[PDB]
Design a protein around this ligand. Sequence first.
Ligand SMILES: *SC[C@H](NC(=O)CC[C@H](N)C(=O)O)C(=O)NCC(=O)O
Ligand SMILES: *SC[C@H](NC(=O)CC[C@H](N)C(=O)O)C(=O)NCC(=O)O
Lengths: 214, 214
Amino acid sequence: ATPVTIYGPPLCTAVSRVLATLIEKDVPFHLIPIDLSKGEQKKPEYLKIQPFGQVPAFKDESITLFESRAICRYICDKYADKGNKSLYGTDILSKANIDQWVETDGQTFGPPSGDLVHDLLFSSVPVDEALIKKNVDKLAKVLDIYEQKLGQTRFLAGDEFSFADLSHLPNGDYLVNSTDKGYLFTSRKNVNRWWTEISNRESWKKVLEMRKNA
Amino acid sequence: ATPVTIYGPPLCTAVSRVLATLIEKDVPFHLIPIDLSKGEQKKPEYLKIQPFGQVPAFKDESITLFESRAICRYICDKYADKGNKSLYGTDILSKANIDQWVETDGQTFGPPSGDLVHDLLFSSVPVDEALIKKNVDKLAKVLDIYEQKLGQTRFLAGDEFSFADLSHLPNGDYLVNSTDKGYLFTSRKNVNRWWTEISNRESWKKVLEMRKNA
Ligand SMILES: *SC[C@H](NC(=O)CC[C@H](N)C(=O)O)C(=O)NCC(=O)O
Ligand SMILES: *SC[C@H](NC(=O)CC[C@H](N)C(=O)O)C(=O)NCC(=O)O
């Protein structure tokens, strides 16, 4: 197989999402750097690839894709028979059952957690501590619902790790390990169990190792 | 087959997304009301169906699902042979090509446009004109990119209507028809062409009618 091409730095949450997915699916890849600190993602040449001037972007022999969850769904389809076969289900029901919790990442967990990560770690503008308080409360109410769900099932969608869990890793990791908001996860028993299990998965450990080696 | 069951009011954008998809896919359904003006979505029996206390929810003979886009992917999957057969593509590549624009709805267009609709039409608290402007500016930037894309293809993902276009209808229609931010769409000639084209589909007209008879 020819390695697929991924654009962007591993430190980027949306890039990490794709990388963890590739590793779970045993898909070889080649990572092309895009230096966000130098604004390289806004260069006309890159905009030909990702028209919104964001990373990641994905290329293989057949298609160019953007939006990390779309990239991941394609990887899971194309390589269904490979690696972790059950990551995004094995049939129409199991896929949909996982998918609703992927959408919960995208629409519910993702916005407050992502804004927290951005405002605390990746913004050059002074932290509006009111806006922080708003999003912490937002995220706490979400995790209170996760707490009940995770008292019924080991992972969000059922008994096995799925792409719905994987998709929480990038924002979760920055909050737990690079901000003082980790207690939102670790003070909730079932959420803490879940977070501890998913963050210690070998694929995610491999992504963290990639960040370490630049 | 048996009709599927959908929960919530058609005035809800996320419910509207599901309804338009059901109609495109020629799927029979029962719509069960949930009055948001009276807190019905928070009653314990409904929380058993939708753990976030939001609408829509979906049930058929095999599964209960929430999150409108997951509900719609399931419908397109289960009823692929029915109705509009190409709505979410017909193989792995055409599906992924559409899906990236569906994610653009979910992560890029959706948040600022949805926030505008909320702050302008469905919020008790006085509008913060600075936050209004922040989101107008975000959405302008997104639609500048749409304008370029829609000068190359008739719809977002190509020359045929897809779920990616469908998913924009709920927030688009509120902005265009119930706010003074419609110029965002109508001032851009290709976006305006596209908007007119998708919002005049019978499926969308039917959803707007259901609203009236609600
Ligand atoms: S992580 C760096 C930023 N990327 C994204 O936010 C990608 C978001 C998409 N919704 C996705 O693929 O999931 C980024 O590119 N920031 C630079 C910028 O100029 O925005
Ligand atoms: S449209 C009314 C509200 N629902 C949603 O926002 C659903 C969003 C999901 N991400 C989706 O299914 O797409 C709603 O239910 N408001 C009531 C409330 O108490 O929040």
